[PDB]
Ligand binder design. Structure first.
Ligand SMILES: *[C@@H]1O[C@H](CO)[C@@H](O)[C@H](O)[C@H]1NC(C)=O
Ligand SMILES: *[C@@H]1O[C@H](CO)[C@@H](O)[C@H](O)[C@H]1NC(C)=O
Lengths: 62, 49
């Protein structure tokens, strides 16, 4: 459902959070287009407690 | 699946995640549901009840 980083929950502005076995990517809902999570790809709002199912991961800041 | 099983092959979709995409179809951001999904469930079942 979301990605945790520095105590901040990251949600995909458009697309779906996916992983193959190890690496995390965000892709659309009608075509598998894997792209690395980037600040411009997600928006942060809140903390890593209210959500259920959040996954610890790193985010790459451009 | 949600809305997928009418277009073509039915792709599995977590129901907690299906709502966030249904909320996003009404101009309501995804994190609105996730932050209070317990209230959503508690309130949806009461209305069905
Ligand atoms: C997942 O994909 C990335 C890049 O596409 C690759 O580096 C990684 O090894 C893949 N992991 C698995 C388990 O296939
Ligand atoms: C993510 O990391 C934080 C700090 O290291 C930890 O408190 C939390 O339990 C971790 N979450 C998971 C799902 O491992």
């Amino acid at each position: 459902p979301a990605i945790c980083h520095d105590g901040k929950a990251h949600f995909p502005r458009e697309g779906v959070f996916v992983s193959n076995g190890t690496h995390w990517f965000v892709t659309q809902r009608n075509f598998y287009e894997p792209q690395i999570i980037t600040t411009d790809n997600t928006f942060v709002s809140g903390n890593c407690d209210v959500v259920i199912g959040i996954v610890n991961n790193t985010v790459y800041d451009p | 699946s949600g809305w997928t099983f009418g277009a073509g092959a039915a792709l599995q979709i977590p129901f907690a995640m299906q709502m966030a995409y249904r909320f996003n179809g009404i101009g309501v951001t995804q994190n609105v549901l996730y932050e209070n999904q317990k209230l959503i469930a508690n309130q949806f079942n009461s209305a069905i009840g």
